[PDB]
Amino acid sequence: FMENFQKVEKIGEGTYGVVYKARNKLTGEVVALKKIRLTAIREISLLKELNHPNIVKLLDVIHTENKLYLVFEFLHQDLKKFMDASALTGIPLPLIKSYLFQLLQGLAFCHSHRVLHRDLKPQNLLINTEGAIKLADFGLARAFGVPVRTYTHEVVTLWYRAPEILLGCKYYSTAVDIWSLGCIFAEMVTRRALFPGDSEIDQLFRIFRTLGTPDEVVWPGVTSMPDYKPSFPKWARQDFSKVVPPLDEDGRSLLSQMLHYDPNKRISAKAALAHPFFQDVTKPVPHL
Numbered sequence: 001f002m003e004n005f006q007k008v009e010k011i012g013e014g015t016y017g018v019v020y021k022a023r024n025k026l027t028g029e030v031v032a033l034k035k036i037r038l039t040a041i042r043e044i045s046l047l048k049e050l051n052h053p054n055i056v057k058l059l060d061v062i063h064t065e066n067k068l069y070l071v072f073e074f075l076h077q078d079l080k081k082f083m084d085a086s087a088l089t090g091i092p093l094p095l096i097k098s099y100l101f102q103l104l105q106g107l108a109f110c111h112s113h114r115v116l117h118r119d120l121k122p123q124n125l126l127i128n129t130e131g132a133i134k135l136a137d138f139g140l141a142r143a144f145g146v147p148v149r150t151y152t153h154e155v156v157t158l159w160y161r162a163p164e165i166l167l168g169c170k171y172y173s174t175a176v177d178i179w180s181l182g183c184i185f186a187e188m189v190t191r192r193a194l195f196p197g198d199s200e201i202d203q204l205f206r207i208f209r210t211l212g213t214p215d216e217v218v219w220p221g222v223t224s225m226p227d228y229k230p231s232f233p234k235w236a237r238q239d240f241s242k243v244v245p246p247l248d249e250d251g252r253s254l255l256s257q258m259l260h261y262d263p264n265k266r267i268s269a270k271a272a273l274a275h276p277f278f279q280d281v282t283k284p285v286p287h288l
């Protein structure tokens with residue numbers, strides 16, 4: 001068990017537990033080791049076979065004592081730190097394009113196996129110095145749920161939550177991850193979060209003030225959803241030229257389709273990979 005791992009240093013804190021850089025004494029490997037204090041065993045075990053170059057590899061599940069240990073491949077840094085480092089200059093658009101293209105590939109793979117993430121955010125998008133970006137903590141939400149506060153009581157962010165989740169749908173689809181990635185795409189471009197809400201209703205109303213309050217025309221069935229209130233204010237939609245300047249029209253077209261209100265109209269990961277915005281996509285080397 002854990003005797004085979006030498007903790008090197010603490011590198012993060014998830015909603016469920018703490019993450020260490022560790023050395024596997026048996027293999028020589030450097031890994032990221034997450035310790036969770038305590039159906040899950042089977043669901044998490046399934047995730048070990050969800051291998052893709054844009055998914056952080058789950059190397060091992062160790063179940064000993066009242067604790068679950070997940071061993072991951074080690075990556076250099078997360079996208080949140082990189083965005084913060086690029087606050088003055090911005091991430092170059094070719095690199096933005098490459099990151100979005102790679103994450104959509106990851107998403108199309110997971111979604112094809114009917115796995116959703118449900119909690120995408122810059123902090124679980126991890127990068128290396130080659131130019132790769134990978135989705136992390138994939139599928140761990142279906143096991144335990146997404147809490148209001150982490151095990152350290154930090155507030156879990158709502159900024160990337162799709163509107164059908166915020167409106168109280170409990171049987172939502174892969175489209176929720178397309179929404180989250182669209183919010184992240186916009187944030188890389190503008191260097192500001194698109195919808196930085198600090199409560200569920202503040203989050204919902206920020207979406208409404210930019211994209212228009214949804215109605216039965218743009219989203220059939222919306223007015224019957226669990227948390228929908230007829231007393232919601234009615235705001236007009238803004239034009240994307242105001243939302244993400246200076247993204248070109250291909251990028252604005254793609255972003256608008258990732259942010260469609262109706263989950264059934266929202267673009268899939270697979271159709272997004274065919275969008276003309278990626279006609280000239282390349283794999284640049286980032287400056288970390």
Ligand SMILES: CNS(=O)(=O)c1ccc(Nc2ncc3ccc(C(=O)N4CCC[C@@H]4C)cc3n2)c(C)c1
Nearest residue numbers: 013014032034072073074075076077078081124136
């Ligand atoms: C501190 N921000 S950093 O300074 O830029 C930063 C971020 C990540 C890592 N590397 C890393 N590698 C694999 C992981 C695999 C999984 C996890 C993990 O369980 N999570 C739960 C919360 C979010 C994260 C995905 C973290 C990993 N973290 C490093 C060395 C630095």
